Amino acid sequence: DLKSLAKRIYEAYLKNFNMNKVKARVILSGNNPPFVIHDMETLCMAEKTLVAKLVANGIQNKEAEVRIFHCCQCTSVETVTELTEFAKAIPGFANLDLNDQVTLLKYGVYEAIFAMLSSVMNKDGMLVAYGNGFITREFLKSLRKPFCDIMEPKFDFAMKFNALELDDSDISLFVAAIICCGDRPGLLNVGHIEKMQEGIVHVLRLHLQSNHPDDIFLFPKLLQKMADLRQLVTEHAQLVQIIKKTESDAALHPLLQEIYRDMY
Numbered sequence: 001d002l003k004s005l006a007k008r009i010y011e012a013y014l015k016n017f018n019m020n021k022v023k024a025r026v027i028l029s030g031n032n033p034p035f036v037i038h039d040m041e042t043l044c045m046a047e048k049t050l051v052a053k054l055v056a057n058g059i060q061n062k063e064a065e066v067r068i069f070h071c072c073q074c075t076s077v078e079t080v081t082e083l084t085e086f087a088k089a090i091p092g093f094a095n096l097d098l099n100d101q102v103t104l105l106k107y108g109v110y111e112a113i114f115a116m117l118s119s120v121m122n123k124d125g126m127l128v129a130y131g132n133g134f135i136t137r138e139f140l141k142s143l144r145k146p147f148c149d150i151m152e153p154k155f156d157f158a159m160k161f162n163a164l165e166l167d168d169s170d171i172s173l174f175v176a177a178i179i180c181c182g183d184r185p186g187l188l189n190v191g192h193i194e195k196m197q198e199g200i201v202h203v204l205r206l207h208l209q210s211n212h213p214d215d216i217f218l219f220p221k222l223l224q225k226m227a228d229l230r231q232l233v234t235e236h237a238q239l240v241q242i243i244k245k246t247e248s249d250a251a252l253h254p255l256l257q258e259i260y261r262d263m264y
């Protein structure tokens with residue numbers, strides 16, 4: 001039954017996420033090749049094709065860094081929708097009280113986002129806009145403060161995460177395990193969530209044993225990555241709060257504002 005459950009989770013991941021690691025690698029390797037964004041000229045060209053409404057405002061267009069942050073938020077909002085549907089495949093999740101489902105997704109979505117971002121990142125840049133753009137790591141570092149500080153820790157995480165050489169069958173189970181953490185603040189049926197966590201982590205552990213016979217510590221490596229992601233999210237939320245307080249034009253989408261509210 002555990003092998004079947006691993007396959008169910010993998011299939012739910014392939015169905016519900018618009019991007020997966022095979023699809024990303026095909027694009028990153030070289031009919032609609034990605035438009036490369038490496039400077040302000042190519043950002044503005046890319047926007048006019050890929051997000052035309054955002055730059056259709058003349059001198060009322062927002063600052064480039066704020067437009068970029070807006071596009072970052074749109075990607076998060078979409079990934080939150082995909083993760084919410086994916087979670088239905090996790091045994092026990094749909095049997096939880098609605099409020100506990102909300103809490104698990106609230107704390108888990110950005111850990112899952114940054115884990116899955118690794119699949120579209122290499123040391124030079126990342127895919128964006130449903131695989132139709134590639135924005136360089138150096139360009140994002142070139143942005144004015146504080147916006148240059150958003151992505152670099154995520155690239156740092158991803159380079160090490162990618163060196164583990166996971167595939168989508170592994171990542172799907174890892175994302176399921178992120179969602180099933182019984183120590184999230186405010187949970188009301190901790191006991192049932194802990195059993196749900198134990199079950200998915202057992203599936204993950206057996207799958208990694210089978211799929212990565214060469215790396216006998218891969219399961220504890222991934223437990224550590226889960227803790228590293230929690231710290232990355234706490235730090236990310238702190239930076240978002242700086243942006244919120246100090247950048248009046250960088251409006252936060254209400255769904256993400258609710259995720260961040262009372263989080264850490």
Ligand SMILES: CCCCCCCC/C=C\CCCCCCCC(=O)O
Binds near residue numbers: 050075076135256
């Ligand atoms: C014209 C395309 C412009 C693309 C800009 C870069 C898009 C980056 C893609 C995904 C960003 C992932 C990080 C999201 C965290 C910041 C936003 C948030 O807190 O939700």
